[PDB]
Amino acid sequence: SAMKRPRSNSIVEETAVSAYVQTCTNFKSNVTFTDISKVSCVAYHVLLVGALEQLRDNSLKSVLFYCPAVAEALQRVKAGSTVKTLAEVPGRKGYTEVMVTALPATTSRTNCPYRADSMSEAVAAACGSVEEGEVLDVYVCAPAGSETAVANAVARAAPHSYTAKAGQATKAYMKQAMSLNVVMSSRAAFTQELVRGKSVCVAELEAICTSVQLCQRLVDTPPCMLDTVVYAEIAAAYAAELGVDMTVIKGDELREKGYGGIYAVGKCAQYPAHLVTLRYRNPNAAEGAKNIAMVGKGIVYDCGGLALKPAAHMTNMKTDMGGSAGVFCAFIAVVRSMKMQRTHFSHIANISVTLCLAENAIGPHSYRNDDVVVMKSGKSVEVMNTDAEGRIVLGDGVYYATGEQDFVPDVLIDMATLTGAQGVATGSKHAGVYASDAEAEKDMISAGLQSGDLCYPVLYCPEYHEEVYKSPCADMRNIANSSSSAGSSCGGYFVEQHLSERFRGPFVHVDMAYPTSNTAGATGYGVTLVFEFLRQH
Amino acid sequence: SAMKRPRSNSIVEETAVSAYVQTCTNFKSNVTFTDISKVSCVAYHVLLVGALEQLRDNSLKSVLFYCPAVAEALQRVKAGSTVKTLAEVPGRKGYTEVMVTALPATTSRTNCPYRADSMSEAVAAACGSVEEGEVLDVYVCAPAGSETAVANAVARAAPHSYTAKAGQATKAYMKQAMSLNVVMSSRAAFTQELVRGKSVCVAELEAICTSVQLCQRLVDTPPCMLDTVVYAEIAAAYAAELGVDMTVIKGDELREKGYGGIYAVGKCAQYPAHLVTLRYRNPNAAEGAKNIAMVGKGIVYDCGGLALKPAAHMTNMKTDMGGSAGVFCAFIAVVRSMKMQRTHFSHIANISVTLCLAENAIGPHSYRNDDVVVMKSGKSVEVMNTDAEGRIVLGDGVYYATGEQDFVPDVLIDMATLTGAQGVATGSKHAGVYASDAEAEKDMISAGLQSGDLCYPVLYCPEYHEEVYKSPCADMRNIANSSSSAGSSCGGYFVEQHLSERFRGPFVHVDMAYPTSNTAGATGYGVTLVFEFLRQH
Amino acid sequence: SAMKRPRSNSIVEETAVSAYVQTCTNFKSNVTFTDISKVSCVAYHVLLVGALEQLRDNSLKSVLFYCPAVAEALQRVKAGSTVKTLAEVPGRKGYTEVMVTALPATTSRTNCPYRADSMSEAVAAACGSVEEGEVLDVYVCAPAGSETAVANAVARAAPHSYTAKAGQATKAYMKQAMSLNVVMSSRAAFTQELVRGKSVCVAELEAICTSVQLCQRLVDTPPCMLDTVVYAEIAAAYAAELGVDMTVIKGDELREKGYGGIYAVGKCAQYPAHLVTLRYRNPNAAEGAKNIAMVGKGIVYDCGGLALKPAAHMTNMKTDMGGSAGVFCAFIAVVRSMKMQRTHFSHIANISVTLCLAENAIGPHSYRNDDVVVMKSGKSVEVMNTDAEGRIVLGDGVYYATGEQDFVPDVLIDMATLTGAQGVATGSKHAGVYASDAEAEKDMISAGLQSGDLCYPVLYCPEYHEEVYKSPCADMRNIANSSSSAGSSCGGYFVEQHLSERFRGPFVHVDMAYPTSNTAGATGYGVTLVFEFLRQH
Ligand SMILES: CCCCC[C@H](CC(=O)NO)C(=O)N[C@H](C(=O)N1CCC[C@H]1CO)C(C)C
Ligand SMILES: CCCCC[C@H](CC(=O)NO)C(=O)N[C@H](C(=O)N1CCC[C@H]1CO)C(C)C
Ligand SMILES: CCCCC[C@H](CC(=O)NO)C(=O)N[C@H](C(=O)N1CCC[C@H]1CO)C(C)C
Ligand SMILES: [Mn+2]
Ligand SMILES: [Mn+2]
Ligand SMILES: [Mn+2]
Ligand SMILES: [Mn+2]
Ligand SMILES: [Mn+2]
Ligand SMILES: [Mn+2]
């Protein structure tokens, strides 16, 4: 295993990567759900979170940790605030920590109506006092239809599994010391009751939780450990677990087979570039079932190339493989759901995920500001800034997915931590969606509201983008000739040009540079956006 | 006149400003329209511009400059290109210059379907060879419904009236040497035929042309000439011409009457701050007629304050009164249309325009990064960056318009060259619209497509904006505590907070920092957006 | 009052400054102390804070809010952490909020052994839930000798009195909604028992609390309100209250009487420069009693002059009058203590405080990088950077205090928010002390450890500083000719050169640029350092 791997020159380093792989390939979330109608014990710690109306309801006096101190906490909580206390509750002996959090009063049209953001903030703050081996009970007052946003909001708010604090290096950088037990007021996960005529079950919410958290792990892991060879070995194990076809083009194979864009970007790095694609044909696909290809930026580290980033922009480029992991782990959850019941993604015939893997490293073998590169699609590109490497590798990615597979997709989802312009456009919680079909734009926005992985449209206007990418000696450049030329859209437009001409349906580009991480680290963004988006028709 | 004015200490300077005022108060466009069915002569220069289909039609052999060289030019023009020639045409003796331009093949959903951008590029390039006193005939092949976009596209593409080249200073910086004669293939302006059941007539298109070009003049004029006292004198003359009510709050009157935000911003400048508001009650208002208030950033020069801008960001801050002029000149055109026929803006009862006038100047009396200012609305503001001055003055503007007039608006339109984040968001041709009502957002986008003054939504999410404006000692700051916090929306949100609580309908903020100008200078952006937006219901 | 003042041209602005003055001239802290042996009621909110040993002692079961939930909180608190709960306690009806905070386990030689920093962090976090008109009880487990550090640590951690949130502008920017009641385990304040043979009484701790908080108010107030004329009017009222001599040199009087350094710095500003000095002869001075002059940088706003600071370095220059306020409010407390008992500062004959008041403003009348200025001391200075304005004004300050008063000081204390080099040197909690006498250095360090206003020596080496201030055409420059030339010491050395030759005892320069403020704003730093320093012999 450690000897199979073509990675480092070192037994010790290789032995520890073999363990890191395991923690990734057998990963399980540390979230459980319990049917509110079957609560018989109460955890060492309890969080209660909901709309102020719902918290003050008499329906809550049933919950098994109700008692006078808790009742008092409910008199004192105001919209947006928190009240915390110890209490002697039945359902436990001794004292129990109860934290009570009201969600905010007002929500706007562009935000998730269940307020999954506040749920995450409230969860995170309750986990801080949970001791090794204990459980945090999370009591959520959210209406039926909110299950996936809750599963996401909680999963992503748990203490992160990647750490090296206090010796964890010796245990594969993996810590899952505590545990979250979700108790929703709605029972739809347990009854399979239909909401907007769709059902989502408990085994699915676990698959989401596992996938969101695997996503936080891969993102959070530094590139000294999660490089392109390791990331690829992981993808292989998930391939053999799920029983799916896998296509890998690696290193010189990229250049030999004409993927000049991604080979150029990753040619300098210690460990080489890969296009890795996993795909499943659904055996229970219905007559109407569409085909879906997904593509993600797997830049394991972005140093900037020769357009080397400064120190303060370069940290966190750990996370520049976020788009990649979002769609990779969404693939896993979707396929897992497909294997659970005949009907679950019945309207999907083929699903494909393409990982565009590479480190953008700086050195003699670096692609230069001025190099001219011939992408797989045939289009020639004049590299003006080597730090716009995402565009390029993704260009070869989307061409592979649209023009080299044995089925033609009917929709292409591009996901990438692409640009800082994104943050200026749409802030740090909403991804930027650059979409060639108004209906697919609306639908992605909506899957964002339902999922709690928010989204917002950015300018789609190829005629205007075309005219800031003009090169004197190639088909296009890879950065615009002007400042303040709608920077996130320009990133999408670049990638759009490399779609095989045989592909005729929507191209949906999700730029999630800022939403992919926050103070605590990786958010898992993307995993639940895609699950929703694909689940809804 | 020159002695009435409380401006400079100088007879000469004051004599020349009196002339500059005149050129502004009697301004007329230099655009005419001629009914295509009544063309009897052909101009020294001719431009033909349209969709390639429409150009190659046999319908064109009728135009009075048809001849073999022209026919040949039509064989050679390809989509997007230009062909130019001299020809002996009947309708003139001697040779005539004919330029033939095909509009582009493909347009996207976010752009004007008539391609008013290409029309403007094509016009501009034909005007360059027109000699003093001559006429350029502009033959446009555009379908009925495109009249306002054409009037705009052409008006704004003429050589600019503000110049000091070759002695023009002695003629009030005003040059209108040539003239454009528009000949559209559609006759709807001349027949009053209904399109989508609305009619627009020739006297209206002239009012638009005049207003777009007055807008380019005011914007283009430097602040050594167009300062707040002069800009105010102009607004007064237009008030007395159109017979409307005018309210001016000036200098110490602002501070005495509680407009701390705008008084703070402009207190350092040579010439003082003004809130200037013009308003008309429509005598022919129908039963349903709504009320409309408009507000614009009139920062005549933005030096940055003490957060002084560098040299290269500071040039063109001439144009930082663009939002102001767009809505001011839209007011003029709208009111002019109202005075033309009983029915023309029948669904509008009251219209108001508020100019937020001030120079952001640097000096001892400057408002500081740390000053705390009490806006008219009562909300206290902690100034962290004095270069976000637009927010502030506009804050007092919208409060005046929503809370101090003798009618309550049902819609507030805020227009401002507000932020560079705008350019990063939505490029240099599309304004950023920050809108509190999804229907009003869609409607503004649409008035942009019909008008050729383009637009694109930006994130509306006050819950997320609220949390980056937190101050420890005031209600809010005036810049966000984070980079990449959706910068254009944050600008709108700041202004939104100062709306009087009595105002209950949509707030539509248009951030047009980049679309307000291009290489040649001021575009007139805003004038035709607002005309369309208000004309459609 | 509002008409006496030579300030603004405005009745409204002047009426509100008259009220701001009042809030400053009648200021009282909102801290009280209660003898632990006489606690009969318990407040709505309670904080318990101490060393873990002391918290777990059985001595605590007596406190009137002891009960089982509280007992449980004490089992759970670990060194450095916090535990919070509601409880039914006797001493109150209903529920009471109890927060329990353990101070940190380990302290180093350069920090206050009572850990006044953690006390402040713990207080601040308990005040956040206290409602209008309520009381927070603060139970501190600290040994006798810690009274002044506690009075300081708590006073400075209260919610700040300067605010404009929610209409406070209409109530003079003054909010004191809640109240803190300190209950120390030691009774030395109440018994007058001697510690290291010195006693400190309750009326003194109140005078400290009042002075620390007046200091936070003056600092926190922006310069649009707290300018040099207002700051001077305040100093006058405190002069007439305390019955002390006052000398003011203002505006042209500075230049006429030879104070070129400070007149130069402040000549550009809206409101003019002042040297303001307050001084008391102690009627109960003992035979040995020394004389003490104090001097502080009162730069009410530092824009940088023509060496204009960028936006992000310029905010918080509100606080550039911190050194000034520290020593001003220390003067008040000391004098107040003197008036309380015959013996209290018996070893002090004369005390003097000199405020070096000015705004460093940018404009035509600005002192330039290249101007040569003749300080009061006769020494000529070549201004190379106008943003090193503190040095200069303080130079005239120390000369006044050492050479123009009717007594000669035996020690000069210079206090100033002088340099950013300070932060690089000694961090954000320790001031930099540049001291001409090793014994006075040690003593100031020690008054810092006892007071909780920390301190740390910086390089004293005039022979090395002399050689980086060489000018070709003046006695010295005002900034060093080299980067990384011990920047905080160089600031002190500049000021040292302007001491009158008649002054022969120690010069102690305290550079407190970073310790003067934190996230929440002004810390009051300086007030309690000086009280301690002077109290100890
Ligand atoms: C033109 C540079 C390439 C655009 C894409 C990069 C983001 C990136 O590195 N993707 O791989 C970017 O936006 N970088 C930001 C950026 O805009 N930069 C980089 C240096 C200055 C400024 C120039 O646009 C930083 C500051 C977050
Ligand atoms: C935070 C500054 C205030 C935001 C608004 C200004 C635009 C403005 O001056 N309006 O009056 C801006 O975006 N300025 C741009 C900008 O973003 N700046 C200014 C200096 C660096 C950078 C900081 O955001 C420039 C470069 C076009
Ligand atoms: C040489 C400048 C004058 C030294 C004193 C100033 C602090 C000050 O302004 N006092 O009134 C300083 O240290 N400023 C800092 C500083 O060191 N600067 C200012 C700009 C760059 C750098 C140069 O030393 C800033 C960044 C906190
Ligand atoms: Mn990247
Ligand atoms: Mn990059
Ligand atoms: Mn501006
Ligand atoms: Mn500005
Ligand atoms: Mn200073
Ligand atoms: Mn300075």
Numbering used by the authors:
A (entry chain A), B (entry chain A), C (entry chain A): 3 to 539
Quote the authors verbatim.
Leucine aminopeptidase (LAP) is found in all kingdoms of life and catalyzes the metal-dependent hydrolysis of the N-terminal amino acid residue of peptide or amino acyl substrates. We report here the X-ray structures of three kinetoplastid acidic LAPs (LAP-As from Trypanosoma brucei, Trypanosoma cruzi, and Leishmania major) which were solved in the metal-free and unliganded forms, as well as in a number of ligand complexes, providing insight into ligand binding, metal ion requirements, and oligomeric state. LAPs of the M17 family of aminopeptidases are bilobal proteins with a highly conserved C-terminal domain harboring the aminopeptidase activity. They form homohexamers of approximately 330 kDa with the active sites facing a central cavity separated from the bulk solvent but accessible through solvent channels.
LmLAP-A crystallized under many different conditions, forming hexagonal plate-like crystals, one of which, grown in the presence of actinonin, diffracted to 2.5 Å and was in space group P321. Structural differences in LmLAP-A compared to TbLAP-A and TcLAP-A are mostly located in the loop regions. The secondary structure elements and their positions in LmLAP-A are nearly identical to those in TbLAP-A, with the exceptions of β1, β3, and β4, which are shortened, and α2, which is replaced by a loop. The N terminus of LmLAP-A is extended and forms a loop before the start of the α1 helix. For both the TbLAP-A and LmLAP-A complexes, the electron density was sufficient to model the ligand, albeit with less than 100% occupancy. Actinonin in LmLAP-A and TbLAP-A is coordinated by the Mn2+ ions and hydrogen bonds. In both structures, the two Mn2+ atoms coordinate the O-2 and O-4 oxygen atoms of the ligand. The N-14 atom of actinonin coordinates a water molecule. Superposition of the active sites including the actinonin molecules reveals the high similarity of the conformations actinonin adopts, with the only difference being in the hydroxymethyl-pyrrolidine moiety, which forms a hydrogen bond in TbLAP-A but not in LmLAP-A, where it is bent away from the corresponding residue (A424).
